[PDB]
Design a binder for this molecule. Structure first.
Ligand SMILES: COCCOC[C@@H](C)OC[C@@H](C)N
Ligand SMILES: COCCOC[C@H](C)N
Ligand SMILES: COCCOC[C@H](C)N
Ligand SMILES: N=C(N)NCCCCN
Ligand SMILES: [Cl-]
Ligand SMILES: [Cl-]
Ligand SMILES: [Cl-]
Ligand SMILES: [Cl-]
Length: 341
């Protein structure tokens, strides 16, 4: 009996994807989930993960490659590879030279999820939901505390977002930018932040328990759809703010000690099938990286500019770079100060 172990982000597959694969191939899939790049990276660096496939963000994979934790993908076993968007492959190749190790899966942005009615009640009809001012201006966050504020537990993304907002290089290599202005602003915001978490905010937005969050786009659209399906009167939306936002590219990769490689390739080729991955986008509200799949995606998802953004919006997006050891240390120490504030 063939088995296959997969570690993916939570809320990042359709409900029947695995069952359909199992029914087709006769392979038993053990599927587990995470909500943190740091948790995944720690597992990869500490020893065997026990998984045959894992799904880091590409900027984290860039760092992980130098430790040798992945094995290169045999493209001859990935004939549906051609379906992938060549322009996205080129962007991911900045992290994964010649696309040797990573298969792009989904991509989106780190923006603001919010309860439309609650934010307009607190900050008025002209609340600045088009701007990071909504949540990074202390005077606004002090008022939104009234209905609940969450930030991602994602230090590289939060600091890059703050640096961009402050007019710095999002990937600044100046240590004082982290210890000075970025820490200063985050510490002024901290008293108003209910929690730092990268998955509880979905249901809390959907249920009305928080009214604003730093969130990943498709997670927030899921929250919006859950409220609609519940017919609970909660109206959640998502904003890519005017100052720009971070884009991320999540990728499948194969640990170097994977046990069931043939099964892993069967699963990857299944995901390269346009109807399979379009079906996933339909349920998780994320743009997939498969150009052949785009016309098969539901119009509700494909025509949402907060999911498949147009060129003028993509032009304002930035990506993470890997930081050197000094900046990595300074950033991690600053994040510790912020969470316990
Ligand atoms: C795993 O392969 C058999 C398919 O069963 C799926 C469900 C019904 O049972 C396993 C649960 C515990 N995830
Ligand atoms: C467990 O082996 C793979 C076959 O399972 C089919 C499931 C019941 N959908
Ligand atoms: C065609 O989608 C690629 C999206 O890329 C975003 C970059 C930052 N421009
Ligand atoms: N920022 C990232 N690399 N990934 C976020 C994906 C979240 C899917 N629920
Ligand atoms: Cl069994
Ligand atoms: Cl090595
Ligand atoms: Cl008003
Ligand atoms: Cl449709």
């Amino acid at each position: 009996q063939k088995t296959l172990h997969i570690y993916n982000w939570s809320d990042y597959i359709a409900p029947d994807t695995v069952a359909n694969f199992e029914k087709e191939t006769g392979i038993k899939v053990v599927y587990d989930v995470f909500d943190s790049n740091e948790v995944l990276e720690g597992k990869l660096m500490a020893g065997s993960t026990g998984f045959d496939l894992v799904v880091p963000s590409a900027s984290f994979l860039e760092r992980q490659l130098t430790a040798g934790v992945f094995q290169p993908l045999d493209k001859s076993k990935l004939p549906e590879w051609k379906n992938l968007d060549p322009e996205l492959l080129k962007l991911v190749a900045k992290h994964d030279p010649d696309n040797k190790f990573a298969m792009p899966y989904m991509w989106a942005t780190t923006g603001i999820g919010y309860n439309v009615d609650k934010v307009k009640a607190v900050l008025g009809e002209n609340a600045p939901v088009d701007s990071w001012d909504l949540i990074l201006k202390p005077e606004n966050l002090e008022k939104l505390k009234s209905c609940g504020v969450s930030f991602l537990d994602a230090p590289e993304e939060v600091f890059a977002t703050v640096l961009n907002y402050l007019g710095k290089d999002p990937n600044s290599t100046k240590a004082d930018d982290y210890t000075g202005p970025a820490t200063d602003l985050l510490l002024k915001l901290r008293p108003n932040i209910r929690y730092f978490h990268s998955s509880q905010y979905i249901n809390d937005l959907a249920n009305g328990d928080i009214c604003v969050a730093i969130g990943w786009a498709g997670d927030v659209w899921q929250a919006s759809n859950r409220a609609k399906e519940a017919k609970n009167g909660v109206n959640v939306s998502f904003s890519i703010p005017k100052e720009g936002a971070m884009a991320f590219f999540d990728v499948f990769a194969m640990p170097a000690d994977a046990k069931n490689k043939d099964e892993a390739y069967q699963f990857l080729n299944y995901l390269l099938r346009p109807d399979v991955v379009a079906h996933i986008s339909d349920h998780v509200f994320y743009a997939n990286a498969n150009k052949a799949a785009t016309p098969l995606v539901s119009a509700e998802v494909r025509e949402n500019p907060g999911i498949y953004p147009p060129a003028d919006v993509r032009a304002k997006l930035f990506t993470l770079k890997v930081q050197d050891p000094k900046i990595d240390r300074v950033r991690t120490r600053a994040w510790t100060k912020v969470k316990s504030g």
